Amino acid sequence: HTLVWGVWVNGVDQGDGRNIYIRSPPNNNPVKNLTSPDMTCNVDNRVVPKSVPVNAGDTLTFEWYHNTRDDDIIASSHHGPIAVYIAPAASNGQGNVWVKLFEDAYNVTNSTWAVDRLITAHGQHSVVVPHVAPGDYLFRAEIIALHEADSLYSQNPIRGAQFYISCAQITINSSDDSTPLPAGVPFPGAYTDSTPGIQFNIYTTPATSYVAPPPSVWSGALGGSIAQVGDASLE
Ligand SMILES: O[C@@H]1[C@@H](O)[C@H](O[C@@H]2CO[C@@H](O[C@@H]3CO[C@@H](O)[C@H](O)[C@H]3O)[C@H](O)[C@H]2O)OC[C@H]1O
Ligand SMILES: O[C@@H]1[C@@H](O)[C@H](O[C@@H]2CO[C@H](O)[C@H](O)[C@H]2O)OC[C@H]1O
Ligand SMILES: *[C@@H]1O[C@H](CO)[C@@H](O)[C@H](O)[C@H]1NC(C)=O
Ligand SMILES: O[C@@H]1[C@@H](O)[C@H](O)OC[C@H]1O
Ligand SMILES: [Cu+2]
Numbered sequence: 001h002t003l004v005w006g007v008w009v010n011g012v013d014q015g016d017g018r019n020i021y022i023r024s025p026p027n028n029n030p031v032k033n034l035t036s037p038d039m040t041c042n043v044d045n046r047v048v049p050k051s052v053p054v055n056a057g058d059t060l061t062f063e064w065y066h067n068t069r070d071d072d073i074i075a076s077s078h079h080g081p082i083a084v085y086i087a088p089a090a091s092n093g094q095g096n097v098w099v100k101l102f103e104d105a106y107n108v109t110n111s112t113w114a115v116d117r118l119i120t121a122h123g124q125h126s127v128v129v130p131h132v133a134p135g136d137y138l139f140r141a142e143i144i145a146l147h148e149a150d151s152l153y154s155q156n157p158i159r160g161a162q163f164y165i166s167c168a169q170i171t172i173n174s175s176d177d178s179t180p181l182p183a184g185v186p187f188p189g190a191y192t193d194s195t196p197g198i199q200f201n202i203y204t205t206p207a208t209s210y211v212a213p214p215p216s217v218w219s220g221a222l223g224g225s226i227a228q229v230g231d232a233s234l235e
Pocket of ligand 1: 077
């Protein structure tokens with residue numbers, strides 16, 4: 001159970017985004033139904049009044065929280081991967097439009113899942129804004145908690161992988177457009193019951209055998225990290 005409070009750009013807090021530049025749902029409940037329209041941007045997908053201005057090459061940091069800002073972030077039981085997608089805003093997230101900019105699942109060196117490191121990062125994870133056309137975009141951050149992912153929701157709706165999905169409205173002002181955005185995947189649609197990484201047993205299968213769901217990260221993506229960029233207790 002987790003939500004996005006807001007974003008930072010190049011280490012500068014853009015302020016509370018909830019229902020303002022984030023298409024915030026009403027609470028921190030997970031999405032579990034892989035075929036629902038809630039998979040696109042969570043249960044309250046509507047245009048909110050502001051979009052955060054960035055330029056290509058900027059560092060865009062999402063900041064998650066559990067109940068209040070900069071708390072325990074998300075229960076430590078909720079091991080799993082983190083991904084970030086982008087789509088043009090004119091799509092409203094419909095169609096084959098979501099392009100993956102970032103994926104982190106299990107780090108063999110530190111023996112930690114993305115979620116574990118997200119907690120340590122005080123909720124913060126970043127992507128570098130790609131050199132796409134200037135314009136309005138949706139950035140879709142997705143945490144997949146795997147503590148009940150040994151079962152399929154479609155078979156047992158008490159269990160299943162849990163998706164914590166947040167869409168931010170971002171405007172890219174300056175960019176050379178050196179890597180035009182390609183077409184992507186649909187949400188819902190990309191993930192199905194037989195997609196790798198959706199059904200998995202984290203208690204008995206080594207985390208080193210986990211494969212995150214496709215699609216793979218786009219070759220135009222400029223990377224990102226799970227790491228604190230700013231101190232919420234100061235600003
Ligand atoms: O010993 C192992 C068991 O622990 C494992 O059981 C899972 C433990 O986590 C359960 O999910 C909880 C649901 O309620 C949330 O508030 C908690 O944060 C979650 O941890 C899950 O339902 C159990 O299957 O099974 C394998 C054993 O080896
Ligand atoms: O100079 C920046 C401001 O531009 C920034 O304003 C953010 C931008 O993104 C969204 O529109 C949000 O609603 C605004 O508050 O705030 C931080 C400041 O340093
Ligand atoms: C999943 O959502 C789809 C599309 O809205 C819906 O038809 C189906 O009833 C849902 N399944 C469950 C178990 O709620
Ligand atoms: O539903 C509960 C939610 O209110 C809380 O914020 O996180 C734990 C959940 O079980
Ligand atoms: Cu939860």
